[PDB]
Each structure stands twice: as C-alpha cells, then as structure tokens.
PDB file of all heavy atoms in Angstrom:
ATOM      1  N   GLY F   1      -8.068   3.295 -14.391  1.00  0.00           N
ATOM      2  CA  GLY F   1      -8.289   3.695 -13.016  1.00  0.00           C
ATOM      3  C   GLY F   1      -7.539   4.934 -12.565  1.00  0.00           C
ATOM      4  O   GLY F   1      -7.238   5.814 -13.380  1.00  0.00           O
ATOM      5  N   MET F   2      -7.257   5.025 -11.262  1.00  0.00           N
ATOM      6  CA  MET F   2      -6.616   6.191 -10.665  1.00  0.00           C
ATOM      7  C   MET F   2      -5.259   5.849 -10.058  1.00  0.00           C
ATOM      8  O   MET F   2      -5.056   4.750  -9.541  1.00  0.00           O
ATOM      9  CB  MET F   2      -7.521   6.761  -9.583  1.00  0.00           C
ATOM     10  CG  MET F   2      -8.884   7.161 -10.109  1.00  0.00           C
ATOM     11  SD  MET F   2     -10.004   7.729  -8.826  1.00  0.00           S
ATOM     12  CE  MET F   2      -9.547   9.454  -8.775  1.00  0.00           C
ATOM     13  N   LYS F   3      -4.344   6.820 -10.084  1.00  0.00           N
ATOM     14  CA  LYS F   3      -3.015   6.663  -9.501  1.00  0.00           C
ATOM     15  C   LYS F   3      -2.380   8.029  -9.262  1.00  0.00           C
ATOM     16  O   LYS F   3      -2.526   8.930 -10.090  1.00  0.00           O
ATOM     17  CB  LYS F   3      -2.098   5.835 -10.405  1.00  0.00           C
ATOM     18  CG  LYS F   3      -0.705   5.635  -9.823  1.00  0.00           C
ATOM     19  CD  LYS F   3       0.174   4.777 -10.719  1.00  0.00           C
ATOM     20  CE  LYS F   3       1.558   4.609 -10.120  1.00  0.00           C
ATOM     21  NZ  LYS F   3       2.465   3.771 -10.954  1.00  0.00           N
ATOM     22  N   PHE F   4      -1.652   8.170  -8.145  1.00  0.00           N
ATOM     23  CA  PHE F   4      -0.851   9.368  -7.904  1.00  0.00           C
ATOM     24  C   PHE F   4       0.536   8.988  -7.397  1.00  0.00           C
ATOM     25  O   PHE F   4       0.746   7.912  -6.829  1.00  0.00           O
ATOM     26  CB  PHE F   4      -1.508  10.386  -6.914  1.00  0.00           C
ATOM     27  CG  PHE F   4      -1.787   9.849  -5.528  1.00  0.00           C
ATOM     28  CD1 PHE F   4      -0.953  10.185  -4.468  1.00  0.00           C
ATOM     29  CD2 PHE F   4      -2.872   9.021  -5.276  1.00  0.00           C
ATOM     30  CE1 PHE F   4      -1.196   9.709  -3.187  1.00  0.00           C
ATOM     31  CE2 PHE F   4      -3.122   8.551  -3.992  1.00  0.00           C
ATOM     32  CZ  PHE F   4      -2.278   8.894  -2.951  1.00  0.00           C
ATOM     33  N   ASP F   5       1.491   9.886  -7.654  1.00  0.00           N
ATOM     34  CA  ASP F   5       2.925   9.620  -7.513  1.00  0.00           C
ATOM     35  C   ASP F   5       3.385   9.846  -6.071  1.00  0.00           C
ATOM     36  O   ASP F   5       4.057  10.822  -5.730  1.00  0.00           O
ATOM     37  CB  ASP F   5       3.702  10.486  -8.491  1.00  0.00           C
ATOM     38  CG  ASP F   5       3.467  11.962  -8.259  1.00  0.00           C
ATOM     39  OD1 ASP F   5       2.665  12.295  -7.355  1.00  0.00           O
ATOM     40  OD2 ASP F   5       4.065  12.782  -8.987  1.00  0.00           O
ATOM     41  N   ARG F   6       2.981   8.924  -5.201  1.00  0.00           N
ATOM     42  CA  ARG F   6       3.299   9.040  -3.784  1.00  0.00           C
ATOM     43  C   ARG F   6       3.057   7.735  -3.029  1.00  0.00           C
ATOM     44  O   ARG F   6       2.008   7.108  -3.198  1.00  0.00           O
ATOM     45  CB  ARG F   6       2.472  10.170  -3.202  1.00  0.00           C
ATOM     46  CG  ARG F   6       2.813  10.530  -1.814  1.00  0.00           C
ATOM     47  CD  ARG F   6       2.002  11.716  -1.432  1.00  0.00           C
ATOM     48  NE  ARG F   6       2.362  12.917  -2.182  1.00  0.00           N
ATOM     49  CZ  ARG F   6       3.364  13.732  -1.863  1.00  0.00           C
ATOM     50  NH1 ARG F   6       4.110  13.497  -0.791  1.00  0.00           N
ATOM     51  NH2 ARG F   6       3.607  14.796  -2.616  1.00  0.00           N
ATOM     52  N   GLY F   7       4.014   7.321  -2.191  1.00  0.00           N
ATOM     53  CA  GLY F   7       3.957   6.037  -1.526  1.00  0.00           C
ATOM     54  C   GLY F   7       3.598   6.124  -0.045  1.00  0.00           C
ATOM     55  O   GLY F   7       3.372   7.191   0.522  1.00  0.00           O
ATOM     56  N   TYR F   8       3.537   4.944   0.578  1.00  0.00           N
ATOM     57  CA  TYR F   8       3.248   4.847   2.005  1.00  0.00           C
ATOM     58  C   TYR F   8       4.338   5.529   2.824  1.00  0.00           C
ATOM     59  O   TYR F   8       5.495   5.623   2.403  1.00  0.00           O
ATOM     60  CB  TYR F   8       3.123   3.383   2.443  1.00  0.00           C
ATOM     61  CG  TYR F   8       4.343   2.545   2.150  1.00  0.00           C
ATOM     62  CD1 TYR F   8       5.410   2.521   3.031  1.00  0.00           C
ATOM     63  CD2 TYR F   8       4.426   1.769   1.001  1.00  0.00           C
ATOM     64  CE1 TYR F   8       6.529   1.775   2.770  1.00  0.00           C
ATOM     65  CE2 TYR F   8       5.542   1.000   0.740  1.00  0.00           C
ATOM     66  CZ  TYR F   8       6.590   1.006   1.634  1.00  0.00           C
ATOM     67  OH  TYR F   8       7.712   0.251   1.393  1.00  0.00           O
ATOM     68  N   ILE F   9       3.968   5.985   4.024  1.00  0.00           N
ATOM     69  CA  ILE F   9       4.932   6.669   4.882  1.00  0.00           C
ATOM     70  C   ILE F   9       5.849   5.665   5.571  1.00  0.00           C
ATOM     71  O   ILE F   9       7.077   5.761   5.470  1.00  0.00           O
ATOM     72  CB  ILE F   9       4.219   7.580   5.900  1.00  0.00           C
ATOM     73  CG1 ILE F   9       3.518   8.739   5.187  1.00  0.00           C
ATOM     74  CG2 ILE F   9       5.219   8.168   6.885  1.00  0.00           C
ATOM     75  CD1 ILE F   9       2.099   8.464   4.823  1.00  0.00           C
ATOM     76  N   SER F  10       5.272   4.680   6.302  1.00  0.00           N
ATOM     77  CA  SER F  10       6.121   3.759   7.061  1.00  0.00           C
ATOM     78  C   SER F  10       6.289   2.436   6.324  1.00  0.00           C
ATOM     79  O   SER F  10       5.289   1.851   5.881  1.00  0.00           O
ATOM     80  CB  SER F  10       5.529   3.497   8.444  1.00  0.00           C
ATOM     81  OG  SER F  10       6.323   2.581   9.182  1.00  0.00           O
ATOM     82  N   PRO F  11       7.526   1.916   6.188  1.00  0.00           N
ATOM     83  CA  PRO F  11       7.715   0.604   5.548  1.00  0.00           C
ATOM     84  C   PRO F  11       7.431  -0.546   6.493  1.00  0.00           C
ATOM     85  O   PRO F  11       8.168  -1.537   6.539  1.00  0.00           O
ATOM     86  CB  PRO F  11       9.186   0.641   5.111  1.00  0.00           C
ATOM     87  CG  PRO F  11       9.835   1.546   6.098  1.00  0.00           C
ATOM     88  CD  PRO F  11       8.812   2.596   6.435  1.00  0.00           C
ATOM     89  N   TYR F  12       6.344  -0.424   7.242  1.00  0.00           N
ATOM     90  CA  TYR F  12       5.866  -1.504   8.074  1.00  0.00           C
ATOM     91  C   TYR F  12       4.492  -1.976   7.641  1.00  0.00           C
ATOM     92  O   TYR F  12       4.023  -3.010   8.133  1.00  0.00           O
ATOM     93  CB  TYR F  12       5.812  -1.054   9.540  1.00  0.00           C
ATOM     94  CG  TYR F  12       7.165  -0.728  10.154  1.00  0.00           C
ATOM     95  CD1 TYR F  12       7.250   0.011  11.329  1.00  0.00           C
ATOM     96  CD2 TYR F  12       8.354  -1.132   9.551  1.00  0.00           C
ATOM     97  CE1 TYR F  12       8.475   0.320  11.895  1.00  0.00           C
ATOM     98  CE2 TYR F  12       9.584  -0.826  10.112  1.00  0.00           C
ATOM     99  CZ  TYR F  12       9.641  -0.098  11.280  1.00  0.00           C
ATOM    100  OH  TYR F  12      10.863   0.208  11.836  1.00  0.00           O
ATOM    101  N   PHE F  13       3.845  -1.256   6.730  1.00  0.00           N
ATOM    102  CA  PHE F  13       2.533  -1.623   6.227  1.00  0.00           C
ATOM    103  C   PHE F  13       2.603  -2.705   5.161  1.00  0.00           C
ATOM    104  O   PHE F  13       1.559  -3.112   4.639  1.00  0.00           O
ATOM    105  CB  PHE F  13       1.846  -0.385   5.648  1.00  0.00           C
ATOM    106  CG  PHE F  13       1.622   0.709   6.649  1.00  0.00           C
ATOM    107  CD1 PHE F  13       2.377   1.872   6.603  1.00  0.00           C
ATOM    108  CD2 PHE F  13       0.643   0.592   7.623  1.00  0.00           C
ATOM    109  CE1 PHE F  13       2.164   2.891   7.517  1.00  0.00           C
ATOM    110  CE2 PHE F  13       0.434   1.609   8.542  1.00  0.00           C
ATOM    111  CZ  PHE F  13       1.197   2.759   8.486  1.00  0.00           C
ATOM    112  N   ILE F  14       3.799  -3.175   4.825  1.00  0.00           N
ATOM    113  CA  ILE F  14       3.973  -4.142   3.747  1.00  0.00           C
ATOM    114  C   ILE F  14       3.494  -5.506   4.235  1.00  0.00           C
ATOM    115  O   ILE F  14       4.125  -6.126   5.095  1.00  0.00           O
ATOM    116  CB  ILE F  14       5.431  -4.193   3.284  1.00  0.00           C
ATOM    117  CG1 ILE F  14       5.839  -2.822   2.743  1.00  0.00           C
ATOM    118  CG2 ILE F  14       5.623  -5.263   2.221  1.00  0.00           C
ATOM    119  CD1 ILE F  14       7.322  -2.676   2.542  1.00  0.00           C
ATOM    120  N   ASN F  15       2.376  -5.973   3.679  1.00  0.00           N
ATOM    121  CA  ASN F  15       1.813  -7.278   3.994  1.00  0.00           C
ATOM    122  C   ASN F  15       1.842  -8.223   2.800  1.00  0.00           C
ATOM    123  O   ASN F  15       1.066  -9.182   2.759  1.00  0.00           O
ATOM    124  CB  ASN F  15       0.376  -7.126   4.487  1.00  0.00           C
ATOM    125  CG  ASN F  15      -0.551  -6.594   3.413  1.00  0.00           C
ATOM    126  OD1 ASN F  15      -0.139  -6.352   2.275  1.00  0.00           O
ATOM    127  ND2 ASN F  15      -1.817  -6.434   3.762  1.00  0.00           N
ATOM    128  N   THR F  16       2.722  -7.982   1.834  1.00  0.00           N
ATOM    129  CA  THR F  16       2.634  -8.666   0.550  1.00  0.00           C
ATOM    130  C   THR F  16       3.589  -9.845   0.423  1.00  0.00           C
ATOM    131  O   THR F  16       3.271 -10.802  -0.292  1.00  0.00           O
ATOM    132  CB  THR F  16       2.891  -7.678  -0.596  1.00  0.00           C
ATOM    133  OG1 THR F  16       2.582  -8.291  -1.855  1.00  0.00           O
ATOM    134  CG2 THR F  16       4.328  -7.219  -0.603  1.00  0.00           C
ATOM    135  N   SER F  17       4.757  -9.797   1.064  1.00  0.00           N
ATOM    136  CA  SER F  17       5.763 -10.850   0.913  1.00  0.00           C
ATOM    137  C   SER F  17       6.184 -10.960  -0.552  1.00  0.00           C
ATOM    138  O   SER F  17       6.328 -12.051  -1.107  1.00  0.00           O
ATOM    139  CB  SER F  17       5.248 -12.187   1.452  1.00  0.00           C
ATOM    140  OG  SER F  17       6.221 -13.214   1.327  1.00  0.00           O
ATOM    141  N   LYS F  18       6.359  -9.804  -1.174  1.00  0.00           N
ATOM    142  CA  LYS F  18       6.509  -9.638  -2.612  1.00  0.00           C
ATOM    143  C   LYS F  18       7.303  -8.342  -2.777  1.00  0.00           C
ATOM    144  O   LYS F  18       7.948  -7.881  -1.830  1.00  0.00           O
ATOM    145  CB  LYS F  18       5.119  -9.691  -3.293  1.00  0.00           C
ATOM    146  CG  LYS F  18       5.063  -9.691  -4.848  1.00  0.00           C
ATOM    147  CD  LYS F  18       5.792 -10.883  -5.481  1.00  0.00           C
ATOM    148  CE  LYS F  18       5.643 -10.879  -7.004  1.00  0.00           C
ATOM    149  NZ  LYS F  18       6.392 -11.981  -7.668  1.00  0.00           N
ATOM    150  N   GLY F  19       7.262  -7.743  -3.957  1.00  0.00           N
ATOM    151  CA  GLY F  19       8.042  -6.548  -4.222  1.00  0.00           C
ATOM    152  C   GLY F  19       7.626  -5.279  -3.489  1.00  0.00           C
ATOM    153  O   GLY F  19       7.297  -4.275  -4.129  1.00  0.00           O
ATOM    154  N   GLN F  20       7.619  -5.309  -2.151  1.00  0.00           N
ATOM    155  CA  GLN F  20       7.519  -4.101  -1.323  1.00  0.00           C
ATOM    156  C   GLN F  20       6.204  -3.360  -1.569  1.00  0.00           C
ATOM    157  O   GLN F  20       6.173  -2.171  -1.898  1.00  0.00           O
ATOM    158  CB  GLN F  20       8.719  -3.174  -1.557  1.00  0.00           C
ATOM    159  CG  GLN F  20      10.077  -3.779  -1.197  1.00  0.00           C
ATOM    160  CD  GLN F  20      10.228  -4.051   0.286  1.00  0.00           C
ATOM    161  OE1 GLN F  20       9.834  -3.234   1.120  1.00  0.00           O
ATOM    162  NE2 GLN F  20      10.828  -5.190   0.623  1.00  0.00           N
ATOM    163  N   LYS F  21       5.107  -4.088  -1.378  1.00  0.00           N
ATOM    164  CA  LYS F  21       3.770  -3.597  -1.667  1.00  0.00           C
ATOM    165  C   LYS F  21       2.885  -3.748  -0.440  1.00  0.00           C
ATOM    166  O   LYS F  21       3.029  -4.690   0.343  1.00  0.00           O
ATOM    167  CB  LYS F  21       3.119  -4.353  -2.852  1.00  0.00           C
ATOM    168  CG  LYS F  21       3.785  -4.125  -4.205  1.00  0.00           C
ATOM    169  CD  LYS F  21       2.963  -4.702  -5.360  1.00  0.00           C
ATOM    170  CE  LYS F  21       3.043  -6.224  -5.413  1.00  0.00           C
ATOM    171  NZ  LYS F  21       2.347  -6.785  -6.602  1.00  0.00           N
ATOM    172  N   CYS F  22       1.971  -2.805  -0.278  1.00  0.00           N
ATOM    173  CA  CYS F  22       0.846  -2.962   0.627  1.00  0.00           C
ATOM    174  C   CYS F  22      -0.365  -3.162  -0.271  1.00  0.00           C
ATOM    175  O   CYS F  22      -0.655  -2.312  -1.119  1.00  0.00           O
ATOM    176  CB  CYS F  22       0.700  -1.748   1.544  1.00  0.00           C
ATOM    177  SG  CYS F  22      -0.602  -1.888   2.802  1.00  0.00           S
ATOM    178  N   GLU F  23      -1.042  -4.298  -0.119  1.00  0.00           N
ATOM    179  CA  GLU F  23      -2.050  -4.724  -1.083  1.00  0.00           C
ATOM    180  C   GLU F  23      -3.321  -5.129  -0.350  1.00  0.00           C
ATOM    181  O   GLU F  23      -3.299  -6.050   0.474  1.00  0.00           O
ATOM    182  CB  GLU F  23      -1.488  -5.870  -1.935  1.00  0.00           C
ATOM    183  CG  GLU F  23      -2.355  -6.321  -3.094  1.00  0.00           C
ATOM    184  CD  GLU F  23      -1.636  -7.328  -3.985  1.00  0.00           C
ATOM    185  OE1 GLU F  23      -0.460  -7.644  -3.697  1.00  0.00           O
ATOM    186  OE2 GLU F  23      -2.238  -7.792  -4.978  1.00  0.00           O
ATOM    187  N   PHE F  24      -4.420  -4.430  -0.641  1.00  0.00           N
ATOM    188  CA  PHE F  24      -5.697  -4.633   0.029  1.00  0.00           C
ATOM    189  C   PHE F  24      -6.804  -4.906  -0.983  1.00  0.00           C
ATOM    190  O   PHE F  24      -6.675  -4.607  -2.173  1.00  0.00           O
ATOM    191  CB  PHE F  24      -6.076  -3.403   0.860  1.00  0.00           C
ATOM    192  CG  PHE F  24      -5.207  -3.180   2.067  1.00  0.00           C
ATOM    193  CD1 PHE F  24      -5.140  -1.928   2.640  1.00  0.00           C
ATOM    194  CD2 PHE F  24      -4.447  -4.199   2.616  1.00  0.00           C
ATOM    195  CE1 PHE F  24      -4.351  -1.698   3.743  1.00  0.00           C
ATOM    196  CE2 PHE F  24      -3.657  -3.970   3.726  1.00  0.00           C
ATOM    197  CZ  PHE F  24      -3.606  -2.725   4.284  1.00  0.00           C
ATOM    198  N   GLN F  25      -7.907  -5.468  -0.481  1.00  0.00           N
ATOM    199  CA  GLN F  25      -9.131  -5.639  -1.257  1.00  0.00           C
ATOM    200  C   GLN F  25     -10.325  -5.242  -0.400  1.00  0.00           C
ATOM    201  O   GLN F  25     -10.435  -5.672   0.752  1.00  0.00           O
ATOM    202  CB  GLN F  25      -9.299  -7.084  -1.743  1.00  0.00           C
ATOM    203  CG  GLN F  25      -8.271  -7.512  -2.770  1.00  0.00           C
ATOM    204  CD  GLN F  25      -6.969  -7.943  -2.138  1.00  0.00           C
ATOM    205  OE1 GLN F  25      -6.915  -8.233  -0.941  1.00  0.00           O
ATOM    206  NE2 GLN F  25      -5.905  -7.977  -2.932  1.00  0.00           N
ATOM    207  N   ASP F  26     -11.220  -4.432  -0.970  1.00  0.00           N
ATOM    208  CA  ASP F  26     -12.447  -4.003  -0.295  1.00  0.00           C
ATOM    209  C   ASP F  26     -12.127  -3.216   0.980  1.00  0.00           C
ATOM    210  O   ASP F  26     -12.536  -3.573   2.089  1.00  0.00           O
ATOM    211  CB  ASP F  26     -13.346  -5.205   0.000  1.00  0.00           C
ATOM    212  CG  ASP F  26     -13.880  -5.846  -1.267  1.00  0.00           C
ATOM    213  OD1 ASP F  26     -14.037  -5.115  -2.271  1.00  0.00           O
ATOM    214  OD2 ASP F  26     -14.132  -7.070  -1.267  1.00  0.00           O
ATOM    215  N   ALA F  27     -11.389  -2.124   0.792  1.00  0.00           N
ATOM    216  CA  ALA F  27     -10.896  -1.283   1.874  1.00  0.00           C
ATOM    217  C   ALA F  27     -11.765  -0.041   2.036  1.00  0.00           C
ATOM    218  O   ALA F  27     -12.521   0.341   1.140  1.00  0.00           O
ATOM    219  CB  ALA F  27      -9.449  -0.857   1.611  1.00  0.00           C
ATOM    220  N   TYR F  28     -11.630   0.599   3.194  1.00  0.00           N
ATOM    221  CA  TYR F  28     -12.185   1.928   3.404  1.00  0.00           C
ATOM    222  C   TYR F  28     -11.156   2.996   3.063  1.00  0.00           C
ATOM    223  O   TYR F  28      -9.954   2.736   2.996  1.00  0.00           O
ATOM    224  CB  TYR F  28     -12.644   2.139   4.844  1.00  0.00           C
ATOM    225  CG  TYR F  28     -13.877   1.370   5.236  1.00  0.00           C
ATOM    226  CD1 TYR F  28     -13.789   0.227   6.016  1.00  0.00           C
ATOM    227  CD2 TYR F  28     -15.136   1.818   4.862  1.00  0.00           C
ATOM    228  CE1 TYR F  28     -14.921  -0.462   6.391  1.00  0.00           C
ATOM    229  CE2 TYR F  28     -16.274   1.132   5.224  1.00  0.00           C
ATOM    230  CZ  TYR F  28     -16.163  -0.008   5.991  1.00  0.00           C
ATOM    231  OH  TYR F  28     -17.300  -0.693   6.361  1.00  0.00           O
ATOM    232  N   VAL F  29     -11.646   4.221   2.891  1.00  0.00           N
ATOM    233  CA  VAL F  29     -10.806   5.363   2.555  1.00  0.00           C
ATOM    234  C   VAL F  29     -11.150   6.510   3.496  1.00  0.00           C
ATOM    235  O   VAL F  29     -12.329   6.800   3.728  1.00  0.00           O
ATOM    236  CB  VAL F  29     -10.993   5.801   1.090  1.00  0.00           C
ATOM    237  CG1 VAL F  29     -10.117   7.012   0.775  1.00  0.00           C
ATOM    238  CG2 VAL F  29     -10.692   4.656   0.140  1.00  0.00           C
TER     239      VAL F  29
END
C-alpha cells in the first residue's frame, strides 16, 4: 500500500485507546 512520513497535527484525533493512533475504516479524503 501507501505511506508517507508525517503524522496528525492535533493529538486530539486519537480514537484508538491504543498506541496513539487515529484509526478509521471507509473514510473520505
């Protein structure tokens, strides 16, 4: 797949309750 070396801006988008991840399925871009 695809990946680039850059993270989220605000650490409030974390919805994972896990290792500091924002994790979505079937999202828009």
Side-chain angles (χ1 to χ4, degrees):
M2 301 176 87
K3 181 178 179 180
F4 60 103
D5 60 358
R6 188 175 293 276
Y8 57 85
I9 293 92
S10 179
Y12 295 163
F13 299 108
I14 298 167
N15 65 1
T16 190
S17 181
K18 187 60 177 177
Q20 298 294 318
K21 293 190 286 185
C22 184
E23 187 172 359
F24 291 159
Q25 293 82 18
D26 294 331
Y28 289 103
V29 179

